[PDB]
Symmetry: C4
Subunit: 388 residues, 4 copies
């Protein structure tokens, strides 16, 4: 087969339809379902699969105790069939680590996992299910990457890494891989002041990443990558529709080239589709915590610092817990346009539900429709009392 080429634009987004949902915590109440977090979705040319970081234990297992913690030797990037739960028996390990990304270039899949202590972490780059390249920490402070899928064009797969402080200036790099080999890396340029957990998608040979400013910003940084020239720029989403969490209330003027102030040293992985009048932003409904999720249609959100929503769709009720969210698309689907998709991590357990001693999640996933479809709300659906 051939390397995928990013030759299409986004389909017109008029609403979102249900794509996938695994009900993992519900099923895991009485099945051998692995404890996970930081999930995402990624497509092969012939299959789409759920991905996540396992904690090396099942939910009902006693080793689920303490799984609020993010980094350990027992974590691994796993994948499993669309909308099935991540079970011990159906999960495929991609690589070992506690921070990851993965994407198919059209011929084979590249997966990257970072492991190690906070001051000595390293990334291993897998291609065609074999280790090919390794990257040592350059700032010795939790080398970390996207936690959702990367995107490839003509064999070149850009990946965003950060190494350094989570609460101040850090060392962000953009690596360009081909068949797992490092073609090039570059230090972050542009006006984005802090970069974490980028969510990316590709269309008419450009790759757009929406990231998390964990330092001073509650507006989201954007990295725009040219995979042919292997260069990039960065800024913030200009819109006063703020989409980090926690965050201040929406003002009437946003910030294009600096963090919007109000909330320090926190954030959540999120995403957006920036496409002129076809622009949709995702965010938690609550400004205080990771609960609820909504999509908002905000024309020219990227460049217009006065832009407001003209349409929306609730995905998860404010009464229900959400979590990380990110973008993916089926680049191998039929048609003349790419259908925008996304997932929302539905975190259950600690810290918000501390009657149990574990932290896990389930997945809900949506794709865009050209129809104006009716909306439902999609909770995790598990009852904590059952786990007591």
């Amino acid at each position: 087969r051939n390397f995928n080429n990013l030759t299409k634009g986004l389909c017109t987004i008029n609403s979102w339809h249900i794509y996938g949902k695994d009900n993992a915590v519900r099923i895991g109440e009485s099945s051998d379902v692995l404890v996970t977090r930081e999930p995402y979705v990624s497509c092969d040319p012939d299959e789409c699969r759920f991905y996540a970081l396992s904690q090396g234990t099942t939910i009902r297992g006693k080793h689920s105790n303490g799984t609020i913690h993010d980094r350990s030797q027992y974590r691994a990037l796993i994948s499993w069939p669309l909308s099935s739960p991540p079970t011990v028996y159906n999960s495929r390990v991609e690589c070992i680590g506690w921070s990851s990304t993965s994407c198919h270039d059209g011929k084979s899949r590249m997966s990257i996992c970072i492991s190690g202590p906070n001051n000595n972490a390293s990334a291993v780059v897998w291609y065609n299910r074999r280790p090919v390249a390794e990257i040592n920490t350059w700032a010795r402070n939790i080398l970390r990457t996207q936690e959702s899928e990367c995107v490839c064009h003509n064999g070149v797969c850009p990946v965003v890494f950060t190494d350094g402080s989570a609460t101040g200036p850090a060392d962000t790099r953009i690596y360009y891989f081909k068949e797992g080999k490092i073609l090039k890396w570059e230090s972050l340029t542009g006006t984005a002041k802090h970069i974490e957990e980028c969510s990316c998608y590709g269309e008419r040979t450009g790759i757009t990443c929406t990231c998390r400013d964990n330092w001073q910003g509650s507006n989201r940084p954007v990295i725009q990558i040219d995979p042919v020239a292997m260069t990039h720029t960065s800024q913030y989403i200009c819109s006063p529709v703020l989409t980090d969490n926690p965050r201040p209330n929406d003002p009437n003027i946003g910030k294009c080239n600096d963090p919007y102030p109000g909330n320090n040293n926190n954030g959540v992985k999120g995403f957006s589709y920036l496409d002129g009048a076809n622009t949709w932003l995702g965010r938690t409904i609550s400004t205080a915590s990771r609960s609820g999720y909504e999509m908002l249609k905000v024309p020219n959100a990227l460049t217009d610092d006065r832009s407001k929503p003209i349409q929306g769709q609730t995905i998860v009720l404010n009464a229900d817990w959400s979590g990380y969210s990110g973008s993916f698309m089926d680049y191998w689907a039929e048609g003349d346009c790419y259908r925008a998709c996304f997932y929302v991590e539905l975190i259950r357990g600690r810290p918000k539900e501390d009657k149990v001693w574990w932290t896990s999640n389930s997945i809900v996933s949506m794709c865009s429709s050209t129809e104006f479809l009716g909306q439902w709300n999609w909770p995790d659906g598990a009852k904590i009392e059952y786990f007591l």
Copy 2:
């Protein structure tokens, strides 16, 4: 490969032989078997599989409590190997929703799932395991479809939808899909007064659907579809051998173009094979509840309002619980005729068995034989006391 063409007639039906049985509730007593309902069977060119709507929980799981309810965000159309039970580890999710149909056109499979609140539901049409088209509710009252397999001819797959009241005039539409794309839809025509949960099969390029009148009728509506012209007609089975449930006792004159009165606002999904002198009708044995199941040979049942049985076969004893039933055939089998097949849903739990708090089912399935085979009876076989 090629689109299947409906070029054969039905094989002569002289009896029925066992085809499949999954014993799901028996096995689920101590295995991770998903709670389901509304099952069916559908064939690929190289495999036949069981299908059903999962409830997003196992039987022994505590989330099985309350699964009598038909619609929730935790349901999904799943498929699994013939005669195996629907387990967490062997079930493949086709799409997310609480009403479905699915069929293979010879090249790829189309699956349709409806999800949403009762007043804002939508259908998503999957083809080759990718979402392709979406249909919003047109009557804002539980958009719903067949709950058994559709049938394709030369790539065109007709599907019957209903939106609107379950106890009065509703808005029924027949959609015609090809590779998941909508070619055409039409409002229901003919003399059928209410349409639910159609069971369909195809033979010498015609498709026949036997449905459920949930309004005033205890005779079954029939929709006859021309997949080439993409048109249809409708009436009722003329025979006084009534096959809905609940139902009045069999009279000596049936009704061809209007509901046979006696039982309002109820019914059950059922099926028939209408083939002149080779006509067989399925029905519950009880006239009051979903218990027992029998096949009855009723010559020209479709057109003769005096027709009575001349042969029969008991499938499930009246002492045992049945449920939904529907038609399917292996359109890719060897031979010069299509072998008529059907399944019977064996519902266990609520409402009839309320010592448990769940509702699930197992599956039994039969195919026709040209031999006059001896009959057995095929119960679910689980003992409720074991679940207490």
Copy 3:
């Protein structure tokens, strides 16, 4: 590919080596392992698999209670990978019934399952995983077949059926199938007086079956089938080395054309390889019950009514429970000869171990070696006390 042709002779048998063992009862103590009995082994051109009749429940499941009973609606022929246990999640259902046979003809597999009440049973013949032909009971008294693999030559697969009394003259038929279709059947001829549960193998275009006389004989009946002419003969193993169970002690003169007397109305499925000086007989060690298993080299056992052993190999200690045993070979292996193989069913539970309320088994399997290998003994290995 092509139909297999029986062009090779048996390899010289100088000892037996371990081939497969699933430890099903051991593992089933704390895993979802299906209750089975009547197991066997059969090879595809690219894989060899274990086969058995499931009871539609796991061992730890409460529905395991009462599984001593042979016939029910919840039984099915299942297959699963060599030496793995028969689990809910890895078992493939071949067909539904309580008596079976199965074999690959080189192109596709034929499987036959019999189901029904004792007075109205029927066989369904599956080919390429589709139902093709059906056979109704002809004597209305538990239609039953081999319970081990059949053998094919040039597409023709002979199968031995019995219908009628288990304790007197019955109606035995030999059917000849091709691609699941009935070419021919014939009533049993020759001097065998009663036929049950034939174990068969093929070599230089002839098929040899060793069966069970359940009426008056403790010597085993033999059916020799010509799959080209589609004819057969029958007699008994002439050797005074008696191999049924229960049985009298070995005399010095056997019987070629009549039952050897001593034990009425009982027996066990067994096998032999009849090959002149390369002849090996299998039997339980105990003359009273299904315990122990040994192979004995008995030159010209088939034709010499004075023949005694000159070599042997213990497979299962007399202290351990055995059960049914049968023949199979990998007809698609490399080399100029067929390697003789066999399995022994290791029955655990009732009636011999009635502290538990279930009956199940595990499998041990051996193949011949041209070496004179050391012998071990191969028990089931489960401790009943663990199940209490």
Copy 4:
């Protein structure tokens, strides 16, 4: 496809990166994970898999009691996907026995399992998942082999066997197989005085095996095999960096042609990569017991009896239990050199942790990097108290 040819040299080893980890004991606390020991890793041309000897029971199963014992009829060589745990439902049995080796020659896999009583054991050689050759015990004292992967060149796969005393002179043989057939065997020659559990790898058509002297030596014997000439030599690692366990403290002069004294009648399976200045040795950190694991870069360790480490990497902390370790490589990976890999068995349970009555293990695996990567430590990670 073609036979693999050993045409490449080793990649430069500057550090080790995480390759695989299954967390089997952690997951097995509440999942159907098989009890194992003596694990290893071996690659097919299209997949790499974990291997081990099952004990025919799960960890939580009551039959786990007593699994400290090495040899029984319930053991089997199993394989399962990389970094998944060995479960009842995902494990593939290669052959039956309690001592094994396995390797892919480029076309098909050869697996060898030894079974039997201590005085009558036999090896069965499987090729392309079929039994092909058998070897009877020649010294009648626990015939045993490598317990890690063999290596093939141009279809010829050498395997090291030992039969005889574990505490004195034994009968070691090197067998040369092709497609499972015995080409040749030879008695051990050279200056190695005792040989057990060889760990092998291949590079520029030579095969190097690092073994265990269980008699008088705490330095490791090395067998160097020419797979073309089908001949071999043997000696000890000359370096005073002793790598058996238990062992004396490191002296300043090692021994090339005789055991280094201090510890009798014990040892552990281990490995090394002997490659001039690119030489790395593995060993337990403790000199007294199987705890901890480290890699040490020891230039010309094989030939220089004064050689000391100049670099190292800790794999497992001394505080954590280790066990057997061995070599493997992906001979089918891209690039101009073979990437050195190894696994470490992480033994949990008895004898060191006798609060539980079982003995099992998990696996950690590393591969070499040309980068100087930061190091982590990789414990099994299970808490014994959870199993009480």
